[PDB]
Amino acid sequence: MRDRVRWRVLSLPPLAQWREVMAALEVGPEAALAYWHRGFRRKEDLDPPLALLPLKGLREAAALLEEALRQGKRIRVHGDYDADGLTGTAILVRGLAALGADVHPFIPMERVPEHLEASDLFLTVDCGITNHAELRELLENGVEVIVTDHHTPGKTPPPGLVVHPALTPDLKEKPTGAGVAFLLLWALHERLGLPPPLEYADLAAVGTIADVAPLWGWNRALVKEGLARIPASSWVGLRLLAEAVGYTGKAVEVAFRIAPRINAASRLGEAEKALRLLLTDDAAEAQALVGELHRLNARRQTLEEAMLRKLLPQADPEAKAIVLLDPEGHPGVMGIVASRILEATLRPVFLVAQGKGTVRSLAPISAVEALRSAEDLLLRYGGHKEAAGFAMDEALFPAFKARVEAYAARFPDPVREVALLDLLPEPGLLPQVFRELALLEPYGEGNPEPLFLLFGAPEEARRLGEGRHLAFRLKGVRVLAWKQGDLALPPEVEVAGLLSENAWNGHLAYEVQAVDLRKPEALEGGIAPFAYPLPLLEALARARLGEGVYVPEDNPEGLDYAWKAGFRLLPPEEAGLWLGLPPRPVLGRRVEVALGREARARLSAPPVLHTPEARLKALVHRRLLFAYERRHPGLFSEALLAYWEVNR
Ligand SMILES: [Mn+2]
Ligand SMILES: [Mn+2]
């Protein structure tokens, strides 16, 4: 919840690589650091090429589609009911229909009989990887089958043509159902000698974001293309839904405003509505359908809020596993209620309603593995490490509870990490830093928005209402935050926050939105320590007592006070106490380091003459000062190595 949150400072890269990214991407050291951690090291990683990924089975499926089209075979597109499944079938349904195909959708074994009666070619989107037995249409009545999906497969690929990323050896890419739908239509356009179907990238991007797929490589390229096309979409329904939610080109708006609206239709039993919104060219009908989705989303929200309100206060504590029963709960909203409970609790969550079950888990507790430990009690079940689902007779709930509660007790408590890119730059460099981080977008599963660490005594603190909302300043920068129940900041605070560009009344303000705030505590990070920060007062005392000490040539003023006081001056490689920094590395040491307060070495504190790699130096300096002051042997030692190098 709060005592199991670990803050860590990301490691510094080798200076030669840091400088290469800076030069190659034309950015300062802060953004360069972020790029490096995300794997962006060439100008080609920021704008990857949107190309036809060579998935296994893709050429064949496209060949089969050409045959279906030319011979006028009846194509049925069977997609999933969430955003990815719906955008994926809309892509294939619109795509194939534009080429003169006789095609129609079918939205979700007892169905196979009519699946047979209605089609010559059966296309599953975002599903069908594990539906073996239904090889019936392949067998029972000669129906051609194409499976496109990306979900966790089975022990063996199902009958029929199967196109799946995970079945493509080597391939690092992780396209989703809509991504695969999109690649397939593209493969077909290639066979027909037609241009890439880029007008379908917006639908594809919506599905990819909705499925929380990693946003790097091809997925990153697909999303930049689709996000950009939404405003003037070829699909009036998508455009109108984007406008209804005030879309401004952000992947985050799709993830939190557009897709949930599409998903609500499904969860509430009206998935046809969302699909039709994506297939219509009639603006009037689309407008009405957006209204309808807004109504379904409001209903889903109302039900989710009521359920959360009934559940969260229950069996939560420090239980190891939260397992609750709500007999009459709506199964269409419980997945999200379990996610929200998991977050306010850092515990796997298991919910059961109307005989249906959903699991959201984290840390070392595999969701599906907990269910496997109680499998005898279940009618159906399955999922992965983070989410899972099942069906079970509610009479068995108490037995199910103990089973999972004990499964979870086998593991150490889940712990949440907060990753910090670096210390926040000085107020004057925030605009440039913000503009350079800009290029990282779109943010998502692939690349999270970076967080900066602020530290100090809060000043000018002032509340906003009677709630936790409040604002203050740290060394000149305004930070906005929701004080976790308490209000009133301690004397000194540590903040993990997002660099924001806040527009108001035609003007901009560069501030920080705190994601976490807390009393200064141990920070994870740094290298195997060799230099240990010691306050100058303590160091001078020991020096006066006769400890073998080192004072660098620089600030002969300090070297004078030393000589002209009889210190047992020594060279850095043999003195276990240093009062300043040596010019070149001195490892295989294990020494205690002091800078000062009125000391000259403490001049990692003076402002530069920006722009070049002068900013690389200033970041290193600010790092040393911070690690020195926090008495953090690991970050100090790491900063000291970077310090030697940016001076060679
Ligand atoms: Mn799906
Ligand atoms: Mn999917």
UniProtKB/Swiss-Prot annotation:
Query: Subunit structure of this entry?
Result: Monomer. Intact protein binds ss- but not dsDNA.
User: Does the record bear DNA-binding in its keywords?
Assistant: yes
Q: Which residues are involved in binding Mn(2+) 1? A: D80, D82, D126
Q: Which gene specifies this protein's sequence?
A: recJ
- What is this protein's function per UniProt? Single-stranded-DNA-specific exonuclease acting in a 5' to 3' direction; has no detectable activity on ssRNA.
GO MF entries? DNA binding; exonuclease activity; metal ion binding
EC nos:
3.1.-.-
Q: Where Mn(2+) 2 is bound, by residue?
A: D84, D126, H150, D211
Per its UniProt record, what InterPro entries does this chain match? DDH_dom, DHH_sf, DHHA1_dom, RecJ_C_thermales, RecJ_OB, SSDNA_exonuclease_RecJ
The main enzyme category here is hydrolase
**Alphabetical keyword list:** DNA-binding, Exonuclease, Hydrolase, Manganese, Metal-binding, Nuclease
The record's remark on the cofactor is: Requires a divalent cation; Mg(2+) > Mn(2+) > Co(2+). Structures with 1 Mg(2+), or 1 or 2 Mn(2+) were determined; the authors conclude 2 metal ions are required for activity.
The answer to whether UniProt assigns keyword Heme to this entry is no
Cofactor (UniProt): Mg(2+); Mn(2+); Co(2+)
Q: Which Pfam families does the record cross-reference, listed alphabetically?
A: DHH (PF01368), DHHA1 (PF02272), RecJ_C (PF22047), RecJ_OB (PF17768)
Write out the similarity annotation: Belongs to the RecJ family.
What is the protein name given in its UniProt record?
A: Single-stranded-DNA-specific exonuclease RecJ
Under the heading Gene3D superfamilies, the entry gives: 3.10.310.30, 3.40.50.12810, 3.90.1640.30
Q: Which organism is it from?
A: Thermus thermophilus (strain ATCC 27634 / DSM 579 / HB8)
